[PDB]
Amino acid sequence: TINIALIGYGFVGKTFHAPLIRSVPGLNLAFVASRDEEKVKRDLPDVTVIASPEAAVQHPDVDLVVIASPNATHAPLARLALNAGKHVVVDKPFTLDMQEARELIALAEEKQRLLSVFHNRRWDSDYLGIRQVIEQGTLGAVKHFESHFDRFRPEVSGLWFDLGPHLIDQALQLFGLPQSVQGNIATLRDGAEINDWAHVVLNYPAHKVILHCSMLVAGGSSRFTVHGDKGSVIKARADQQESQLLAGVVPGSADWGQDDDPLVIYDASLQAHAQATPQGDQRQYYMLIRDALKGQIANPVPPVEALAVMAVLEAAVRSAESGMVQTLDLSDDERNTLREGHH
Amino acid sequence: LSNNTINIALIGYGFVGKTFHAPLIRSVPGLNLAFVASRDEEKVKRDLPDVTVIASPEAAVQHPDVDLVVIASPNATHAPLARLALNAGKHVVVDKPFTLDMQEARELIALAEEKQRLLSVFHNRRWDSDYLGIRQVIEQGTLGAVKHFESHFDRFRPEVSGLWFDLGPHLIDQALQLFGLPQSVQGNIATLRDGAEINDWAHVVLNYPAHKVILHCSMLVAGGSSRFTVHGDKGSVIKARADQQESQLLAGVVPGSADWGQDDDPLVIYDASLQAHAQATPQGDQRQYYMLIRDALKGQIANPVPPVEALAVMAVLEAAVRSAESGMVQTLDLSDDERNTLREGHH
Ligand SMILES: [Cl-]
Ligand SMILES: [Cl-]
Numbered sequence: 001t002i003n004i005a006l007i008g009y010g011f012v013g014k015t016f017h018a019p020l021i022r023s024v025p026g027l028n029l030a031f032v033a034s035r036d037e038e039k040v041k042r043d044l045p046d047v048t049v050i051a052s053p054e055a056a057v058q059h060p061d062v063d064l065v066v067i068a069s070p071n072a073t074h075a076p077l078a079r080l081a082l083n084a085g086k087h088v089v090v091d092k093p094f095t096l097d098m099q100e101a102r103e104l105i106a107l108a109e110e111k112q113r114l115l116s117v118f119h120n121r122r123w124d125s126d127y128l129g130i131r132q133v134i135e136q137g138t139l140g141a142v143k144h145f146e147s148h149f150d151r152f153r154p155e156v157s158g159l160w161f162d163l164g165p166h167l168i169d170q171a172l173q174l175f176g177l178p179q180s181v182q183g184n185i186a187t188l189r190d191g192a193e194i195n196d197w198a199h200v201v202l203n204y205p206a207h208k209v210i211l212h213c214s215m216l217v218a219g220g221s222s223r224f225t226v227h228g229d230k231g232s233v234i235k236a237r238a239d240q241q242e243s244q245l246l247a248g249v250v251p252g253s254a255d256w257g258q259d260d261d262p263l264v265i266y267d268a269s270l271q272a273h274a275q276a277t278p279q280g281d282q283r284q285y286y287m288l289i290r291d292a293l294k295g296q297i298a299n300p301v302p303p304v305e306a307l308a309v310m311a312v313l314e315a316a317v318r319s320a321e322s323g324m325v326q327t328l329d330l331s332d333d334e335r336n337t338l339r340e341g342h343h
Numbered sequence: 344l345s346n347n348t349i350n351i352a353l354i355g356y357g358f359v360g361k362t363f364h365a366p367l368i369r370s371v372p373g374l375n376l377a378f379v380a381s382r383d384e385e386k387v388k389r390d391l392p393d394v395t396v397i398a399s400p401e402a403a404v405q406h407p408d409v410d411l412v413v414i415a416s417p418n419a420t421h422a423p424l425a426r427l428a429l430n431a432g433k434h435v436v437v438d439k440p441f442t443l444d445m446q447e448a449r450e451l452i453a454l455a456e457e458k459q460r461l462l463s464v465f466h467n468r469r470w471d472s473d474y475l476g477i478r479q480v481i482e483q484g485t486l487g488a489v490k491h492f493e494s495h496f497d498r499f500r501p502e503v504s505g506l507w508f509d510l511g512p513h514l515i516d517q518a519l520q521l522f523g524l525p526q527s528v529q530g531n532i533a534t535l536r537d538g539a540e541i542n543d544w545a546h547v548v549l550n551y552p553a554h555k556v557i558l559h560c561s562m563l564v565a566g567g568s569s570r571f572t573v574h575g576d577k578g579s580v581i582k583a584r585a586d587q588q589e590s591q592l593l594a595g596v597v598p599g600s601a602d603w604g605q606d607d608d609p610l611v612i613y614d615a616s617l618q619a620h621a622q623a624t625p626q627g628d629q630r631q632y633y634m635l636i637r638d639a640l641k642g643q644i645a646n647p648v649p650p651v652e653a654l655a656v657m658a659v660l661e662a663a664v665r666s667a668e669s670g671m672v673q674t675l676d677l678s679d680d681e682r683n684t685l686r687e688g689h690h
Binding site: 139140141143144152154180182184186188189190197199201203206207208210214216217218219220221222225227228229230231232233234264266267268270272323324325 | 487488490491499501527529531533535536537544546548550553554555557561563564565566567568569572574575576577578579580581611613614615617619670671672
């Protein structure tokens with residue numbers, strides 16, 4: 001069994017990590033680092049609460065550390081964990097600096113331990129449905145790929161920083177690294193203080209990718225819109241696993257990851273037909289991390305992939321601030337590794 | 344020739360002259376299409392048995408009985424013929440494109456003012472059912488303050504002057520009419536269809552101080568897009584289908600007739616409750632362009648489409664192309680006096 005020490009029982013720790021981990025056999029959430037034992041124990045009566053994060057990442061019976069503490073503590077605790085010989089999963093952001101990311105990637109390899117980042121959206125119902133239609137050949141060669149994370153919250157780190165990672169990760173998994181990145185980021189809600197509108201375009205040799213998210217969309221947009229030379233596919237509603245976790249649904253239960261919002265496909269005749277959307281399950285992230293730790297498969301989300309996401313994320317910000325199209329700040333070897341990994 | 348009418352010479356009886364101008368003009372009282380310049384009399388006479396056909400454009404434009412010249416000849420002839428018409432003391436309406444470059448456009452504007460004649464450009468999409476509908480919802484205050492305005496021109500033609508230059512103009516013109524001039528323009532233009540040799544995908548963003556405008560053109564959209572998508576802090580509105588006047592004209596429907604400009608595709612509005620309700624889309628009618636030009640010529644009102652507004656569209660059009668090539672956000676190349684006219688023109 002793999003003994004886990006979850007570091008931090010704040011929103012993310014309690015709402016995402018604990019429930020997912022607890023629902024995955026082969027993993028054992030035995031320790032939780034938190035200054036508030038009662039909060040942890042009312043939910044997890046059988047876990048051991050360790051007050052100090054540093055003490056937690058270095059505990060004897062701990063095999064894997066899941067860092068869900070404040071952003072600024074991710075990099076430090078990760079270093080401490082790897083040096084203590086533990087495997088590590090870091091909740092986004094990996095780090096607040098790419099140089100640190102590279103140092104952590106380097107450290108993990110030196111220490112021969114697994115290092116991964118919580119890019120948990122590769123198994124969403126919407127995404128899986130779209131990837132399926134694309135691989136089916138239904139739309140021919142993809143020329144326009146649009147992905148939205150929109151909602152209506154007129155009542156007032158930023159939307160791009162929070163939602164951009166999901167959008168980017170999915171795009172890189174499907175198409176690999178883009179040639180350039182053009183970004184337009186703004187704060188449009190009256191009185192808001194951080195961006196709530198992000199429109200990012202990723203340029204590829206033969207197609208375009210549009211990543212968009214906004215806090216001001218009462219209705220009318222689609223989670224996914226993809227156009228190819230043989231047809232188009234639209235997925236209206238976004239994967240509802242996050243809303244399920246928010247509601248307290250137990251991961252892996254009957255309606256977990258179910259999506260009754262079908263994929264709408266338009267063929268060359270401009271007519272549409274529906275195609276059932278496959279169920280999603282972000283538990284896959286932990287199931288695969290589990291298998292990787294058992295030597296059954298390679299790390300499902302190697303750290304260089306998280307570095308690639310940061311590169312695009314930061315490139316988009318530079319573009320928005322400078323008004324200039326940007327390239328990715330990745331070394332040739334990193335690009336080589338990412339390219340080869342892309343199968 | 345009747346003296347109480349605005350006597351027009353339509354220059355060119357090609358696709359646009361025959362499908363758009365002749366039918367529209369003939370449907371507007373007070374206007375009289377008396378001359379048509381074309382090298383093919385029979386082709387003209389087949390539709391307009393009683394109009395006078397003049398072989399050369401120059402002779403038609405300079406005819407003393409002509410009050411207004413409508414230029415619908417090849418693109419390269421627009422600037423020179425407009426120049427000749429103005430110098431001949433005639434009023435002029437130029438089919439898009441106004442001119443091929445901005446300096447000539449500016450020269451024509453100056454010339455029309457010197458010759459004290461009306462000069463306009465055929466930006467005929469300001470009276471489309473979809474646009475009028477969207478404008479109505481915005482002005483109603485239904486969406487609260489507009490934050491994201493998206494306008495599309497998409498079709499599905501996998502089998503192959505560029506998409507941006509052809510369709511970008513009406514998309515831009517509508518945006519400027521609604522919001523005035525943007526602070527900056529960002530563009531991404533490409534050729535994506537297999538075998539295509541001209542851009543068939545254009546994604547342009549107009550940046551305003553408190554909101555964004557997205558104009559999108561593509562030849563590869565089998566389905567899924569909306570003509571207009573507008574989000575405000577109080578709600579959203581989507582207009583799925585495009586105005587049908589063009590299709591009606593192509594089908595030979597008489598402008599101003601029974602079903603002219605009708606649009607039974609409603610505006611779909613989403614309020615803060617996230618629920619949608621429909622709103623009847625107003626009838627569209629591009630005959631308004633000529634009715635207003637008519638009224639302007641009779642001195643009743645100002646030019647409905649002053650040349651400086653066409654110059655503004657050209658500025659945005661070119662700025663998008665520069666941005667697309669340089670990868671750099673662009674500002675518009677308009678003078679302070681042009682901006683003043685445009686700012687107070689937008690009030
Ligand atoms: Cl992610
Ligand atoms: Cl137009």
